[PDB]
Amino acid sequence: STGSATTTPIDSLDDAYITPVQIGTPAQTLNLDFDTGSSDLWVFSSETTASEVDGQTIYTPSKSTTAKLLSGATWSISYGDGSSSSGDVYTDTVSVGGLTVTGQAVESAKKVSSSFTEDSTIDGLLGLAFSTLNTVSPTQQKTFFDNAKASLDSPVFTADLGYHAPGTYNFGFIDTTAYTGSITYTAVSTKQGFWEWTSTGYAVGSGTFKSTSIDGIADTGTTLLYLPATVVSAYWAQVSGAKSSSSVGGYVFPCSATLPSFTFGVGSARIVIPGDYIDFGPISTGSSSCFGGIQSSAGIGINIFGDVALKAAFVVFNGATTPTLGFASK
Ligand SMILES: NNC(=O)Cc1ccc(F)cc1
Question: How far apart are alpha carbons 232 and 252 in whole angstroms?
């Protein structure tokens, strides 16, 4: 089997991407944030504290003939940005782009933090990291990909995110028309539960590539590219007027600037992030200072290849017995 679904930016900055997901019988379609940096599929629901729902589409398990309460099970998660949610657990039929999993754990939110309430476009998350990070207690549950894997034509999914445009998540096959050149594959460590890999270095603009190992995670659920302070300082030093602002919370630059590209290494291959991808617009409405899309990972504890990096590539998440990541230009 295979599946293919379009993913769509939630706003004009590509802050996140939403993908329609069918849950239950008859189908209830919710728009979920596919997150390769977590492993819970959770949704706004009929059980979510009413005051914490503001415009989201909710899952109503009592209207699904295939919903089943997982007795006594609970879940609770917090994310890198400090947001969080928690609740109880159902299993139900879940389809993504024509690909169906029966008995998928669908984690129903009782509580969500303010950032989720305030984002009316995101109805939940669908985690695609390794199932070892799943937060269901007392018994951890499998991700949609893990459940689907044995049925897939190939044990893979791909992320093809757009720049200010829709893109695609495919399950079970690699669309050889969706990228240019070849896909370069690179080793993955699953020891921390993430799609963790080592980039072979970077370049700023037209500068010479610096060979240096950069461990990080491929994370579709993170907006920006977070890299060591050394790397990030070298990038912004090439932008006139750029500076790190503690009050804003990162590097800012004059909105009138022409940003250089940023290249990261995948083995002997190179992915070039155009300068425009690194502009995240005015720091506040009407400001002539703009927020940068490459920021320091110092304090996070890990480097994160978020959407700014991933949208420059066609990315293969290979869930074979020994997982790997593939990157191609497009
Ligand atoms: N969905 N991604 C996140 O919540 C960001 C993140 C991941 C791992 C980590 F160790 C720190 C932050």
Answer: 12
